């Protein structure tokens, strides 16, 4: 048999991501085997260990899956912290671990803009917010800021200033100036919340110069439940992937089955799927040391294009060809031309 | 048959590129037809027309191509301008023109980073160059900053100032130098030694570049600086990528370039279009081509119906960050 | 006497900038002489010349100011084209020309962030504009025929129109992004929703929304009333305050870029004739070469090599090692 | 009398900064009083406490400074951490602290380019360094690389690869070896520089041996020389006095920390002149919204958060006319 362990935060803080990771792995393996769930006569079984995103539990689960269930290889896990704990548990069992999503037994999944994006969101959440109010000088504006003010109090951001202008201010040079001076050199997030029945007139003044964003805009508040109450809706980071044969299958099949698009994490589990399946097929065995040999320098296909494990650090890199372009001809042409 | 016309500056100012376009196009057709050079029982012939990168010549060549040789579809051309002259000829002749590399009969090739880069290089050549020299205050630092002064005098850059220090790879030196080049447009301190480092530790926060670095000069024949200027870019590997690079190398003993891959896509589009249309009639081709995805060495492209522009054919993925963020705090 | 000529496009396309330039020059000279309009006993006299931003008029006008009116020194002019033409006039008259705001005889005002911003706006207006429409499936269609009409006097192109039922604008916004993608020039989604769309960060396609700031080229042709301004901040200083206090006091408006510009030039001339203790061209070129002078912008300096004016500055550095070595430990 | 406390890391880890902070504080006071070292009849006294950059020492030193010495106000201190421990102390004593350089009693010094540069270097120093080797394939390339390997090994960086060509494909191998690692990725050349540069490593986030401050500012990596952030300041009457005098007295330029100490001194003298007293309460009142001149121009304390900000005038330009022009 071919036993793959998946350590993941099935319950707890990262439970939503953990769902995707498995669904992705199951579809990942299904593609790679053309639906047979067997690789070279070998039946593929998958053993899942909820580690509740707890580093102590994760270690025991990882130890358990190698030792008790006899998993040949492992993927995991949801939480970064937990996965770091697990690195030695791999060496301890002289069996490979693929880190996903989060020594010679560890293969890492790769750098990408989505993690960058998450790290970004994370820092933001871990920083201050300073808000600056803008409203009209009649009851509704002042009631308006009242309620917002009340929402902003369960929050932890600071309100530096409230500006109230007349119902009919069509020129906001002075307000906006007063607003920029209030948020100026603070960190971290500085924001002007307009309540109205001005974003435009204010955006023309270019607030970015101060690092100030306005209440109209995408995801200008930290991805915390406290703020998502003034602003409903989850914070998403968007990205695009050049179509390929695994893309199509994943997107079509996933949509078809769950009436929803695959996500970044879904695609991660699927990639680990390809790594394992590609590797075992390469090595023609499931012996750790023959597996490491196959994988070092191995290219494998993912929903994201061709990947390759760098042998030195066991890291997944996007797999390229290099091109260049000679620009002299076109420049010596372009000049001998405007004259 | 299936007749395809390639217009290009086979000779003249853009001749280096023209050669890539053709090799590329020849190779695209081969890959697409598994070497048979026939599509759906149709034999594929290619007609080439040298327009010398002259608009007047290129208009005739294109007319001639359709009218005299019965080209069912054209590709071209090398020069941006000779290509603008050509747009009407396509319309006047009621046939398709795929514009490469440079109305309803025009289909374009997409925006990419090589073009931007060619763009930039062009802009640079059309702007000023100011130089400040840094040398040693003795015989051959001073003699070698004459050799240069001499060379630099046949180019078109101004020499704003000469600094001669003793041996002082140093601070006061490179400040006299920054203050000298500062607020000029558009383009360099040129070191002659037997300094760079110490200088580089201070920054370019001035727009200043050193004589170390790649392509700090305009890419002009006039400008110790041997060598062509290149813009480098990496592409995610794929089945056409591989075939191209592998075969090009094995054939030509050198990598395929941007204009090679450009020709390849031109070819992929024509073949995919004619396999889709099941005919070579202009109108049934315009219909097949609007919104059709085709495969190229850069991945899947697709023609936007609205403007006949080639776009990278994408899927859209999102990531929800709340959970992770909610996590990092607690 | 001390005779100053100011060339400017007083009437014509750049007339707004001209009044600015004059006011500042006049206020510049006034601040500089503590209201006496006399520099070291010399009476200061200013001759203006409308060139209407026409280059061949502007050469005659400058020529007339040196020759007929006997100006010791000139300043001009409102348009860079008209002022490239004037360079030889000044040489052929053996007299200094201070180029503002736009030979050993020319001297320049400096490169600043507000110039760059104009070069920006100009590139943009000289570029294409493409727009895509989003509205409710009703007054959408009506309101996007009134726009379709308006935009038609414009010169932009309408790539697509998207109508949706009055909820979740993912698929819609995507259709909109795919529609505006790799086009050159400006891309804009004009909505008849906004936030949902902004959450998908259009910046990453080069697409602006119909909410951003100055999404359209500054052209009368472009709903969207109001002028396009580039904003920027200068650190207070004694000249600053005076300019801002008096200008705001006399005109109920703050000094703008062009007003401060005429001011700077005013400060240069005064500083020069005082340091030269004369008005002889040869001695003025001498005085100004490497010369420092205070402006509303701060302390400036004339680079001898190229007669360009630079922010005059001190250099500081900071050693990071001790602090870094601390952090790790 | 007017009594001012300077808390600082005169000895220990931040001793060089502390020295400059003081020098600046003394000259700031000199210039402010035209050498008289008195303001409105008050002799000016300065008391220094070495906190050694120890936070527990520092809350003590500042405690002494207030309670024992009678310091009517305080400036400090060298460490950010020791400065943060000190915040309560000011409050606990009903006396003002100015945080420099690192409560309605705290007044801060401003965010700025130099501090952001320091913060930067710090981050960098707490991050990985990866190296890739390039030398000729003969005797003293391979030896020189050993020498370097010997040095690099007292470091904490990793040598991922060693490339030996004789005297494009090389620098391709090189780039691929460093591509997606964090943080610093460096090709070390022993001898080429120019050819590699032609290929623009920046697009892999890779730097070369030739370069300006490519290594963290740790003594192990120091490749001699200190690491500097360079910046420029618009000349003013204070600039000039400072630079000129410090250059006449110490035969070396003033630095970020000297000017910092100068600004602190300016805040105080300006404040105490404006208040006409040394009373904490009347001082907090005077300082809010207060403008004062420093070696880098006019600052003002923002009331809402007691933060110093470069004091600005806002100017704008209207571009329609010139675009409308450019087109027609």
């Amino acid at each position: 048999d071919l036993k793959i362990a998946l350590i993941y935060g099935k319950t707890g803080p990262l439970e939503a991501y953990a769902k995707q990771t498995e669904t992705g792995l199951m579809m990942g393996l299904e593609y790679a085997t053309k639906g047979t769930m067997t690789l070279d006569g070998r039946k593929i079984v998958v053993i899942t260990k909820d580690d509740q995103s707890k580093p102590d539990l994760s270690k025991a689960a990882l130890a358990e899956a190698y030792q008790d269930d006899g998993a040949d290889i492992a993927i995991g896990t949801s939480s970064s912290a937990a996965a770091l704990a697990d690195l030695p548990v791999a060496e301890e069992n002289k069996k490979i671990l693929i880190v996903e999503p989060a020594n010679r037994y560890i293969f890492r999944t790769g750098r990408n803009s989505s993690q960058d994006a998450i790290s970004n969101a994370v820092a933001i959440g871990k920083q201050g917010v300073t808000i600056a109010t803008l409203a009209q000088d009649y009851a509704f504006g002042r009631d308006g800021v009242a309620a917002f003010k009340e929402a902003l109090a369960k929050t932890g951001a600071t309100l530096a200033t409230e500006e109230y202008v007349p119902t009919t201010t069509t020129d906001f040079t002075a307000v906006g100036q007063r607003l920029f001076d209030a948020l100026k050199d603070k960190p971290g997030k500085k924001i002007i919340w307009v309540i109205w029945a001005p974003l435009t007139k204010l955006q023309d003044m270019d607030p970015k110069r101060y690092g100030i964003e306005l209440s109209t805009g995408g995801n200008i508040l930290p991805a915390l439940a406290a703020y998502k109450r003034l602003m409903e809706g989850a914070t998403y980071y968007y990205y695009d992937i050049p179509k390929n044969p695994i893309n199509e299958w994943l997107v079509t099949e996933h949509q078809k089955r769950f009436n929803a698009p695959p996500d970044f994490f879904t695609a991660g589990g699927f990639s680990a799927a390809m790594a394992v399946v590609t590797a075992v097929q390469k090595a023609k065995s499931t012996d750790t040391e023959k597996l490491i040999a196959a994988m070092e320098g191995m290219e494998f296909d993912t929903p994201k294009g061709k990947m390759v494990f760098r042998k030195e650090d066991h890291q997944a890199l996007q797999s390229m060809y290099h091109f260049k372009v000679k620009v002299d001809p076109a420049v010596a042409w372009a000049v001998l031309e405007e004259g």
Side-chain angles (χ1 to χ4, degrees), chain A residues 1-231 233-339:
Chain A
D1 263 14
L2 205 185
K3 298 161 282 296
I4 307 173
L6 174 69
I7 322 296
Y8 71 153
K10 192 186 212 163
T11 57
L14 290 182
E15 92 196 284
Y17 297 165
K19 302 232 140 317
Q20 266 101 301
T21 297
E22 164 164 37
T23 310
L25 182 74
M26 293 315 281
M27 291 183 69
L29 300 172
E30 176 188 351
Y31 182 110
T33 58
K34 226 106 204 185
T36 72
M37 290 303 323
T38 90
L39 178 48
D40 306 333
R42 265 194 180 92
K43 175 49 172 174
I44 294 163
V45 14
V46 186
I47 300 138
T48 54
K49 297 307 196 185
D50 176 18
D51 78 359
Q52 291 179 28
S53 275
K54 312 199 186 200
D56 81 325
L57 275 165
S58 178
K59 279 186 290 169
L62 204 258
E64 177 188 351
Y66 288 141
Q67 275 140 51
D68 302 19
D69 308 277
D72 287 325
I73 196 145
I75 297 169
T77 180
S78 278
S79 165
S80 341
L84 186 56
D86 303 340
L87 269 41
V89 176
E91 199 171 51
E92 270 157 5
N93 281 101
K94 295 170 88 185
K95 279 193 185 103
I96 300 172
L97 170 81
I98 290 142
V99 177
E100 176 70 38
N103 61 244
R104 29 192 285 81
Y105 296 104
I106 317 296
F107 289 82
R108 278 149 195 194
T109 223
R111 316 283 302 178
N112 53 72
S113 74
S114 275
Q115 300 139 192
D116 284 354
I118 287 173
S119 301
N120 270 84
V122 165
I124 289 155
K126 281 194 272 88
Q127 309 188 67
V129 194
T130 311
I131 285 149
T133 262
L134 178 58
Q136 283 141 126
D137 203 326
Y138 64 78
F140 140 114
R142 303 190 100 120
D143 302 320
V145 174
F148 166 81
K149 225 148 153 286
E150 203 19 58
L152 181 64
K154 313 148 165 288
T155 260
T158 220
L159 215 190
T161 192
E162 309 154 49
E163 286 284 342
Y164 296 91
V165 312
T167 144
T168 176
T169 283
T170 12
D171 186 359
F172 325 66
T173 300
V175 210
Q177 218 95 272
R178 224 139 54 217
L179 257 10
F180 299 156
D181 285 340
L183 300 173
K184 277 177 90 142
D185 283 340
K186 309 173 159 304
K189 261 203 143 55
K190 324 137 193 156
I191 301 166
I192 293 168
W193 196 272
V194 330
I195 291 182
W196 208 274
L199 285 315
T200 306
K201 302 308 227 169
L202 212 49
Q203 253 303 336
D204 292 328
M205 317 201 48
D206 196 14
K208 313 178 290 281
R209 351 192 252 109
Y210 301 101
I212 305 176
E213 323 166 23
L214 284 51
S215 148
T216 285
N219 309 143
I220 66 154
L221 280 169
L224 294 177
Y227 297 103
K228 70 196 221 153
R229 275 189 44 66
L230 312 86
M231 293 295 305
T235 291
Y236 296 103
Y237 159 79
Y238 289 95
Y239 68 103
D240 296 326
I241 302 295
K243 280 179 163 172
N244 72 32
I246 304 190
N247 272 347
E248 296 161 37
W249 189 85
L250 178 51
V251 161
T252 318
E253 281 306 307
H254 192 278
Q255 188 70 54
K256 196 130 73 51
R257 293 168 201 189
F258 310 103
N259 183 42
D263 100 315
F264 162 80
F265 279 118
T266 286
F270 190 125
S271 302
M274 301 296 302
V276 178
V277 167
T278 301
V280 164
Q281 187 211 350
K282 171 79 160 314
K284 300 316 270 201
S285 44
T286 55
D287 163 46
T288 293
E289 291 276 318
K290 300 176 140 33
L291 283 186
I292 294 165
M295 306 186 47
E296 286 175 353
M298 154 178 305
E299 299 170 334
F300 58 104
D301 304 315
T302 67
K304 187 175 61 205
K306 190 72 82 36
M307 299 305 273
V308 60
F309 283 112
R310 180 162 51 198
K311 160 160 178 187
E312 189 262 321
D313 54 349
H314 286 192
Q315 174 64 286
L317 303 165
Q318 181 53 87
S319 181
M320 322 276 196
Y321 281 125
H322 315 270
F323 300 71
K324 60 186 168 186
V325 67
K326 184 180 211 135
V327 307
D328 295 40
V331 184
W333 172 64
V335 286
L336 198 209
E337 193 74 357
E338 184 169 60

